[PDB]
Design a protein around this motif. Structure first.
Motif, PDB file in Angstrom:
ATOM      1  N   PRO A   2      22.161  46.861  38.005  1.00 48.41           N
ATOM      2  CA  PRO A   2      23.262  45.921  38.212  1.00 48.41           C
ATOM      3  C   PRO A   2      23.899  46.121  39.569  1.00 48.41           C
ATOM      4  CG  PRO A   2      23.891  47.654  36.686  1.00 48.41           C
ATOM      5  CD  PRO A   2      22.436  47.828  36.930  1.00 48.41           C
ATOM      6  N   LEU A   3      23.571  45.222  40.486  1.00 49.36           N
ATOM      7  CA  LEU A   3      24.025  45.364  41.855  1.00 49.36           C
ATOM      8  C   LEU A   3      25.418  44.785  42.018  1.00 49.36           C
ATOM      9  CD1 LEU A   3      23.423  46.048  44.840  1.00 49.36           C
ATOM     10  CD2 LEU A   3      22.030  44.001  44.911  1.00 49.36           C
ATOM     11  N   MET A   7      31.073  44.313  44.778  1.00 53.16           N
ATOM     12  CA  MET A   7      30.706  45.503  44.021  1.00 53.16           C
ATOM     13  C   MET A   7      31.741  45.856  42.963  1.00 53.16           C
ATOM     14  SD  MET A   7      27.879  46.429  45.044  1.00 53.16           S
ATOM     15  CE  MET A   7      26.855  45.666  46.265  1.00 53.16           C
ATOM     16  N   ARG A   8      32.977  46.099  43.374  1.00 49.84           N
ATOM     17  CA  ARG A   8      34.084  46.330  42.459  1.00 49.84           C
ATOM     18  C   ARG A   8      35.199  45.379  42.841  1.00 49.84           C
ATOM     19  NH1 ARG A   8      36.294  50.338  39.018  1.00 49.84           N
ATOM     20  NH2 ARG A   8      34.401  51.601  39.300  1.00 49.84           N
ATOM     21  N   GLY A   9      35.642  44.583  41.889  1.00 51.51           N
ATOM     22  CA  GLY A   9      36.648  43.578  42.141  1.00 51.51           C
ATOM     23  C   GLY A   9      36.158  42.207  41.756  1.00 51.51           C
ATOM     24  N   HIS A  10      36.917  41.204  42.163  1.00 56.62           N
ATOM     25  CA  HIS A  10      36.542  39.837  41.858  1.00 56.62           C
ATOM     26  C   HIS A  10      35.609  39.289  42.926  1.00 56.62           C
ATOM     27  CE1 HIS A  10      39.332  39.372  38.495  1.00 56.62           C
ATOM     28  NE2 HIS A  10      40.210  40.042  39.220  1.00 56.62           N
ATOM     29  N   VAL A  13      30.797  47.709  37.547  1.00 58.12           N
ATOM     30  CA  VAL A  13      29.540  48.211  37.015  1.00 58.12           C
ATOM     31  C   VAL A  13      29.791  49.542  36.323  1.00 58.12           C
ATOM     32  CG1 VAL A  13      27.204  48.888  37.663  1.00 58.12           C
ATOM     33  CG2 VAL A  13      28.310  46.993  38.823  1.00 58.12           C
ATOM     34  N   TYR A  33      36.294  40.090  37.336  1.00 56.75           N
ATOM     35  CA  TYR A  33      36.356  41.379  38.018  1.00 56.75           C
ATOM     36  C   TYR A  33      35.033  42.098  37.812  1.00 56.75           C
ATOM     37  CZ  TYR A  33      38.335  45.957  39.333  1.00 56.75           C
ATOM     38  OH  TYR A  33      38.606  47.159  39.944  1.00 56.75           O
ATOM     39  N   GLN A  50      41.363  44.021  48.404  1.00 58.88           N
ATOM     40  CA  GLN A  50      41.249  45.195  47.548  1.00 58.88           C
ATOM     41  C   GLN A  50      39.889  45.255  46.866  1.00 58.88           C
ATOM     42  OE1 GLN A  50      44.169  46.504  49.067  1.00 58.88           O
ATOM     43  NE2 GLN A  50      44.186  47.625  47.119  1.00 58.88           N
ATOM     44  N   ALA A  51      39.231  44.114  46.691  1.00 58.62           N
ATOM     45  CA  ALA A  51      37.878  44.119  46.166  1.00 58.62           C
ATOM     46  C   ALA A  51      36.885  44.528  47.248  1.00 58.62           C
ATOM     47  CB  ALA A  51      37.503  42.757  45.598  1.00 58.62           C
ATOM     48  N   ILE A  52      35.654  44.785  46.817  1.00 58.38           N
ATOM     49  CA  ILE A  52      34.683  45.548  47.587  1.00 58.38           C
ATOM     50  C   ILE A  52      33.350  44.818  47.588  1.00 58.38           C
ATOM     51  CG2 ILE A  52      33.248  47.608  47.394  1.00 58.38           C
ATOM     52  CD1 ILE A  52      35.948  49.065  46.769  1.00 58.38           C
ATOM     53  N   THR A  53      32.802  44.590  48.783  1.00 57.95           N
ATOM     54  CA  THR A  53      31.651  43.726  49.012  1.00 57.95           C
ATOM     55  C   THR A  53      30.565  44.479  49.779  1.00 57.95           C
ATOM     56  OG1 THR A  53      32.677  42.860  51.024  1.00 57.95           O
ATOM     57  CG2 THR A  53      33.044  41.619  48.990  1.00 57.95           C
ATOM     58  N   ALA A  54      29.437  43.795  50.003  1.00 56.99           N
ATOM     59  CA  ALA A  54      28.302  44.318  50.760  1.00 56.99           C
ATOM     60  C   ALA A  54      27.377  43.171  51.143  1.00 56.99           C
ATOM     61  CB  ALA A  54      27.514  45.360  49.960  1.00 56.99           C
TER      62      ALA A  54
END
Lengths: 289, 267, 49, 48, 281
Positions: free
Chosen positions: A128-129, A147-150, A282, A279, A41-45
């Motif tokens: 804030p990346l 990005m958003r999440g843990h 940004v 968590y 559910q969290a969001i990465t890059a």
């Protein structure tokens, strides 16, 4: 007859918010073996980071990344750690400043001393990346930045914390309780002589959610800068400066997990604050004065 | 999966025009209001770009009301749209004049016809004029240039002030150069009236000073007294309505050729 | 002037309880199991009025 | 109630209907119960 | 936690739960945010019966409340899902403003035109809900608290009351509410200072183009804003950029003084104008 019998089929997909995400991931995990990056559910890059920027973040894992608007057109976007701009802020002890100036500075950095201290912070070069997980050391460091999440290990094996250095934290550590705890990020200038001051950075945690009640607890801390903010308003007529402080949401954590720690790096160690269940979230810039 | 908005092509979209819509699969779409069916006359920003006396900020006051939406797929007679879920990643298409870079905050702005007048797949006066998804620090910059050109717009009769305007519409960012009224009345009501009304309020407050800041703040009819302060604060509300640009995205990484960028959606 | 100084004292105590046979008719039901999910843990709240 | 009709001059108690409806009180019990995602992952995952 | 099961803990009626059964989707604040709470905490009423009881302390208090949405009202269980930031939620109207689709809503303490029974004064406890106003009525009702606190600085004792009554009947969309007999309190005073300081710096940064713009416009134009505001060179643009920007630091702050928290942003409004799909906590 026809119409209502078809609409039962689009009705009776219950018990899930869609059952479109969960079911269709399984029909591609049966197809392709057990797939990672799908129960997330969290969001990465994934980000291309050079070897001269690869440090710290590589070794100890779960830490902020920052973009630069460096005023030079060819390397205009340099990745910056929360550890990294400790060699810019006035808060950081000069030993603590030169501890990490010697970690990064090995023949691939010290432009970024001269183009952050020299090319001053307008608090718009930094962005804030997010926070890291799962560095890829190879020919090129390849950081999966959340990005958003843990921030966490794949396989949901370990929550990666937020590595806040000590000097940037305790000058705006909040009050003591056991609740949820929002991490904000504050850049304050001391407008004294040199057109920006020595742009002071802060990682501030507080139970306060609301905006102007949060800058009021900064109106306690920053009178020394605020009275200097009023000073250059009359010390320079025609020239003006900008913002006094700059507030933005950075994330939160569970606030019983707030405990000190240390990183074990080159050029000595570095005393940090370890915020476990962080968590990443940004928020927008709140320019204030 | 996500939210769905279907667009009924009231105008006949030629397969070659569908070929241009099937290139804009990632691009944002300004929707006037959330509803499942919308016309192509509704979809897009051309209903905002259209008046003999229409000002940049008034369009920006309209676009701030318009819901941002993202193209999903173009199936012939229909355009499928997704109102973006806050916090999710979205592949939006860099149809602005600015190259995006990894970590930047993106703000929607109305497209300006100053040296970059642009249209789209137009038939019968409807094109799909597409808002400049511009970085946020440049979005405030573009706003400030527009007001300062308009604050200097009355003094065209001086060439030196005109030469001050001649530098002014030159906007230069990373890999990009582009050229660029009651809001400036709103700037001037705050500039003049705060100069006069604060003097009876600084000298009364400056005695007690908790943050120790009123000291150099001094260095810096009751019906008509409040009438100033009422039309002080309400004009401060009018300018802050057209200053705070309500940030729209956060590009995490940029697709190569700078056509697209995965953007986690914020605000 | 004189002064009356009141002061409380918290005496921590074993307090015994006697209740007759089947005093209060408790009525309960099956513990419902709701389920919150996060990125990293699933928090089951089990409750019954 | 009991009823005793006696005496002369003494004001007798007329027969009294005492009618009485009690009420209930509510207190729910709740324990929270956590399982990590990695624990439920191994139910899903099932390697070699 | 997100789902909040609520103990009533008082002696409610059938006429109570019938009202909330039609009110499913209302906004209830909770301070503690457990899964299991009691109605002493659940609800906003338990702090609007304070003894000082001015708008200055109720507004600054409830920004530490956590809002919830009324769900599954049958009998004695109140499901309150804590909303997440950025999902679409519908909200039943608690205060008579039609909310005018497309705008930001906020949280207003209590009506404070009297003490409204939010549900029913059950065992001398009612459950009063916040007003959710569309941020124009929120900023205006917070403006006038400081308008009439700046007024009481330079008035003796009666031209306050002759000019507060001029300004307290706030004729907004569907509502004519009342300023709560403005009490001079120090949370206003710490922030009325910074407003007066923010008015001072705009006078400093007004670099004689931003100043004279109306006074040059009245010579050329005849506008409604231009005539009502009659009663009410340099070749340095790069410096005017920085002075206008530092002026924009102040007006994004002095608005933020009297503005409130942005909250539920309207997706759609029903033609009943009662249930309103809204996003963005």
């Amino acid at each position: 007859s026809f119409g209502p019998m078809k609409r039962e089929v689009m009705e009776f997909d219950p018990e899930d918010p869609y059952k479109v995400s969960k079911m269709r991931k399984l029909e591609r995990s049966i197809a392709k073996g057990y797939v990672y990056g799908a129960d997330h559910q969290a969001i990465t890059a994934r980000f291309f980071v050079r070897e001269s920027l690869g440090e710290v973040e590589q070794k100890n894992l779960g830490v902020l990344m920052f973009r630069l608007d460096t005023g030079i057109e060819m390397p205009s976007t340099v990745l910056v750690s929360l550890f990294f701009l400790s060699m810019v802020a006035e808060n950081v002890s000069a030993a603590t400043k030169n501890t990490l100036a010697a970690i990064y500075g090995r023949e691939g950095e010290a432009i970024r001393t001269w183009l952050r201290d020299g090319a001053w912070r307008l608090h718009r070069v930094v962005h804030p990346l997010g926070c890291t997980n799962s560095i890829t050391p190879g020919a090129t460091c390849l950081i999966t930045c959340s990005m958003r999440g843990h921030s966490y290990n794949m396989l949901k094996t370990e929550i990666y914390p937020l590595l806040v250095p000590k000097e940037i934290y305790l000058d705006l550590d909040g009050e003591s309780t056991d609740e949820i705890r929002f991490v904000y990020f504050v850049i304050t200038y001391d407008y004294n002589s040199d057109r920006q001051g020595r742009p002071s950075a802060f990682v501030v945690v507080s139970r306060i959610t609301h905006r102007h009640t949060l800058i009021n607890v900064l109106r306690y801390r920053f009178r020394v800068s605020r009275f200097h903010f009023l000073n250059n308003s009359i010390s320079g007529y025609g020239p003006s400066t900008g913002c006094l402080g700059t507030l933005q949401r950075l994330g939160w954590f569970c606030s019983r997990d707030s405990r000190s720690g240390i990183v074990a790096s080159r050029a000595g160690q570095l005393s940090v604050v370890k915020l476990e269940k962080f968590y990443v979230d940004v928020g927008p810039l709140v320019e204030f004065a | 999966m996500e939210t769905t908005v279907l667009v009924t092509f009231e105008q006949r979209l030629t397969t070659g025009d569908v070929g241009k819509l099937s290139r804009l699969i990632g691009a944002v779409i300004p929707i006037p209001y959330r509803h499942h069916l919308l016309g192509s006359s509704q979809v897009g920003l051309d209903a905002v770009v259209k008046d003999k006396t229409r000002d940049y900020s008034r369009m920006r006051a309209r676009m701030r009301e318009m819901t941002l939406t993202i193209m999903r797929r173009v199936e012939g007679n229909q355009m499928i749209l997704g109102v973006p879920t806050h916090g999710q990643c979205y592949t939006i298409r860099n149809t602005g004049p600015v190259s995006w870079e990894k970590g930047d905050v993106l703000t929607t702005l109305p497209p300006v016809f100053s040296g970059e007048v642009t249209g789209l797949v137009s038939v019968s006066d409807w094109d799909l004029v597409l808002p400049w998804i511009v970085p946020m620090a440049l979005a405030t910059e573009i706003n400030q240039r527009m007001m300062m050109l308009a604050l200097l717009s009355l003094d065209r009769s001086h060439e030196e002030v005109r030469a001050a305007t001649a530098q002014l519409r030159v906007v230069r960012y990373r890999d990009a150069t582009l050229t660029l009224r009651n809001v400036c009345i709103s700037l001037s009501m705050i500039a003049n009236l705060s100069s006069e009304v604060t003097l009876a309020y600084v000298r009364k407050l400056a005695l007690e000073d908790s943050n120790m800041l009123l000291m150099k703040c001094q260095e810096i009819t009751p019906t008509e007294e409040l009438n100033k302060l009422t039309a002080l604060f309400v004009m401060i509300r009018q300018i802050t309505d057209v200053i705070s640009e309500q940030p729209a995205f956060l590009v995490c990484d940029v697709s190569p050729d700078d056509k697209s960028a995965l953007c986690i959606y914020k605000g | 002037f004189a002064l009356t100084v009141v002061r409380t004292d918290t005496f921590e105590t074993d307090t015994l309880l006697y209740s007759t046979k089947a005093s209060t008719a408790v009525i309960i039901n099956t513990p419902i199991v709701t389920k919150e999910d996060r990125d990293i843990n699933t928090v089951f709240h089990v409750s019954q009025n | 109630v009991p009823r005793v009709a006696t005496g002369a001059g003494i004001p007798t108690s007329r027969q009294t209907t005492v009618m009485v409806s009690k009420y209930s009180e509510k207190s729910p019990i709740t324990i929270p119960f956590e399982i990590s995602a990695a624990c439920l992952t191994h139910l899903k995952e099932t390697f070699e």
